Write an enzyme that holds these catalytic residues in place. Structure first.
Site, PDB file in Angstrom:
ATOM      1  N   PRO A  94       0.863  -1.175   0.000  1.00  0.00           N
ATOM      2  CG  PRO A  94      -0.041  -1.009   2.113  1.00  0.00           C
ATOM      3  CD  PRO A  94       0.744  -1.958   1.206  1.00  0.00           C
TER       4      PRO A  94
ATOM      5  CG  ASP B  62       5.190  -1.541   2.523  1.00  0.00           C
ATOM      6  OD1 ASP B  62       4.020  -1.419   2.918  1.00  0.00           O
ATOM      7  OD2 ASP B  62       5.714  -2.628   2.327  1.00  0.00           O
ATOM      8  CG  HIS B  63       0.898   3.953   4.938  1.00  0.00           C
ATOM      9  ND1 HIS B  63       1.419   4.326   6.109  1.00  0.00           N
ATOM     10  CD2 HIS B  63      -0.216   4.744   4.769  1.00  0.00           C
ATOM     11  CE1 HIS B  63       0.693   5.279   6.628  1.00  0.00           C
ATOM     12  NE2 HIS B  63      -0.293   5.529   5.817  1.00  0.00           N
ATOM     13  NE  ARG B  64       3.148  -4.116   3.335  1.00  0.00           N
ATOM     14  CZ  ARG B  64       3.525  -5.130   2.571  1.00  0.00           C
ATOM     15  NH1 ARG B  64       2.723  -6.185   2.427  1.00  0.00           N
ATOM     16  NH2 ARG B  64       4.738  -5.187   2.027  1.00  0.00           N
TER      17      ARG B  64
END
Lengths: 243, 243
Positions: free
Chosen positions: A39, A215-217
């Site tokens: 994401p 990577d927003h995670r």
């Protein structure tokens, strides 16, 4: 994942089929695997490189005596290696068990070279340990090796972060795609003279546009704004790398 | 070596005998052994540190957050370590057979601290490998250890070069004595605003006075003028250390 309906394209005019190099197809697959898996968010920032440019240009003598051309890239590589050490979540990867991050204790950085057959991303190992003109030379070597199909796959491996520089063609900013299992990629665009408020009037400063996708995670929004802010700070005074 | 005739000093007025600490006597002997053994020359130069001062002063925040005070000394230590690597005859010693020089492959630098009991020259090891704030801290530690008689003799050993800074008291330049078997010592004095020709008019630049004494047996005049010139160049733009 639903597929795209096939369209008969020759109903609307003359078509012609050109084929894809294996490198484009490899490229294609890896990006789609990154896209569905990561994401993405992109953080934009722009840095004041008026002083970095002057440094670069004054050291043209030295650089030529050493056979390397000094560009903005070795200066980008050096500042991001300092920073990847300061903010280690950027230099790491999600473990396949989804529940841990592998923090890498090493800093190898790749950079995008767009060749005729496709995109190659040669990696420079332990960027933290090399100087500006070492980095300058190596970057240059790997790029020519890449254009000339002479880059052995060993050199496309185990990078911690990617820089993609399009400053040489143009553009204001873009949103690059993360090369999973890396967690961030810095896109860099064309520098322009911009008026900047000095508290009293607008001064012209040379401003480099930067676009960090992450990577927003693994990285949250505040961690990423702190990384491009610090990077903007390091490029405006590279002497901070000294301390 | 002919001795000085003894004079009866009380024939001319009241005298009083104060005694020498063992540290002054040690000091005294080592300097006279350096003086009779080393044919000394001093090379004067002065460097433009207007930009280095501004750097120093802007990083006061960082330095305090790290507990070190940033002074000109860690900046001097760093530039001379780069340079001692570039010009290795400065980082070396005459072999006792008088017919070879021992080039040291390491860079440890001492600096003069004048305490109540005498001069101490604590050594910082592998200055080439430490950053500005590391160097800042260590320098500071060793100085307090030195004032407080807590510096164990291990730390006064095996330096390759000495810096003596008197910039804090004053003076325009001096001629320091080489601490044999080292081959050069940099003396540094008070910085002053000086007019400097810019090709068209005189600009005020902040100029640091430097006085390099050397062992003329090992270093010739042109090698020493090239060392203070390079040093003047490095202090005017410390970013050259990066490349």
């Amino acid at each position: 994942i639903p597929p795209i309906p096939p369209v008969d394209f020759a109903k609307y005019g003359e078509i012609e089929e050109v084929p894809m190099t294996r490198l484009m197809q490899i490229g294609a697959t890896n990006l789609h695997r990154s896209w569905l898996n990561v994401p993405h968010v992109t953080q934009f920032e722009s840095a004041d490189i008026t002083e970095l440019e002057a440094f670069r240009v004054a050291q043209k003598a030295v650089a030529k005596k050493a056979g390397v051309k000094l560009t903005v890239l070795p200066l980008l590589l050096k500042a991001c290696a300092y920073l990847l050490k300061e903010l280690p979540d950027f230099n790491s990867s999600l473990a396949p068990s989804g529940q841990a991050l592998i923090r890498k204790k090493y800093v190898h950085i790749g950079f995008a070279v767009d060749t005729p057959d496709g995109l190659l991303v040669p990696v420079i190992r332990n960027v933290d340990q090399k100087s500006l003109l070492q980095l300058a030379a190596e970057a240059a070597e790997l790029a020519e090796k890449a254009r000339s199909k002479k880059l052995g796959a060993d050199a496309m491996q185990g990078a911690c972060f990617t820089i993609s520089s399009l400053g040489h063609i143009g553009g204001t900013a873009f949103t690059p795609i993360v090369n999973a299992p890396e967690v961030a990629i810095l896109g860099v665009s064309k520098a322009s003279m911009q008026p900047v408020w000095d508290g009293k009037a607008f001064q012209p400063r040379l401003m480099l546009p930067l676009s960090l996708s992450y990577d927003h995670r693994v990285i949250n929004g505040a961690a990423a704004a702190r990384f491009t802010k610090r990077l903007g700070d390091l490029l405006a005074d590279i002497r901070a790398i000294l301390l």
